[PDB]
């Protein structure tokens, strides 16, 4: 469980987007089964971690719009990775518009989590999170 490291990145995000401590546990639990988190700062956390990919991948394969090698190393080939990517894009289209980008992003991640659940293969949280963070 949890091959990507978000610890330091989350810390930096809390100071840069002036976020309370609630995000140190909320970012993680956001992804657990049957958990619906409706807090904006979880949105902000996601948006801000998609800006620090270079700190999350211990092997340095996680980059924006360019994550196939990371995917591969986390149980998913290219067609599998690509389907996660298409769900992020379809989610970025279907989520209602919003000037608060933290809120919109929480929307997208919310929509993403529900769609990837419908996949007959079961993505690790690492490759699921990695892929949305890489397309956001």
UniProtKB/Swiss-Prot annotation:
Listed name of the protein: Pheromone-binding protein
Family of the protein in this entry: Belongs to the PBP/GOBP family.
Tissue localization of expression: Antenna.
Location of this fragment in the whole protein: 29 to 164 of 164
The keyword Protein transport belongs to this UniProt entry's keyword annotation: no
Entry function: This major soluble protein in olfactory sensilla of male moths serves to solubilize the extremely hydrophobic pheromone molecules such as bombykol and to transport pheromone through the aqueous lymph to receptors located on olfactory cilia.
Keyword Transport: yes
GO molecular function terms attached to this record: pheromone binding
Cystine pairings recorded for this chain: 13-48, 44-102, 91-111
GO biological process, one term: response to pheromone
Keywords linked to the UniProt accession: Disulfide bond, Pheromone response, Pheromone-binding, Signal, Transport
Record's subunit section: Homodimer.
């Amino acid at each position: 469980n949890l091959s990507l490291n978000f610890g330091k990145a989350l810390d930096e995000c809390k100071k840069e987007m002036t976020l309370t401590d609630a995000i140190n546990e909320d970012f993680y639990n956001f992804w657990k089964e049957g958990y619906e988190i409706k807090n904006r700062e979880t949105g902000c956390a996601i948006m801000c971690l998609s800006t620090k990919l270079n700190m999350l991948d211990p092997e340095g394969n996680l980059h924006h719009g360019n994550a196939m090698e990371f995917a591969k190393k986390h149980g998913a080939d290219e067609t599998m990775a690509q389907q996660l990517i298409d769900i992020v894009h379809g989610c970025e289209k279907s989520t209602p518009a919003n000037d608060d980008k933290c809120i919109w992003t929480l929307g997208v991640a919310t929509c993403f989590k529900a769609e990837i659940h419908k996949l007959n293969w079961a993505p690790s949280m690492d490759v699921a999170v990695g892929e949305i963070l890489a397309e956001v």
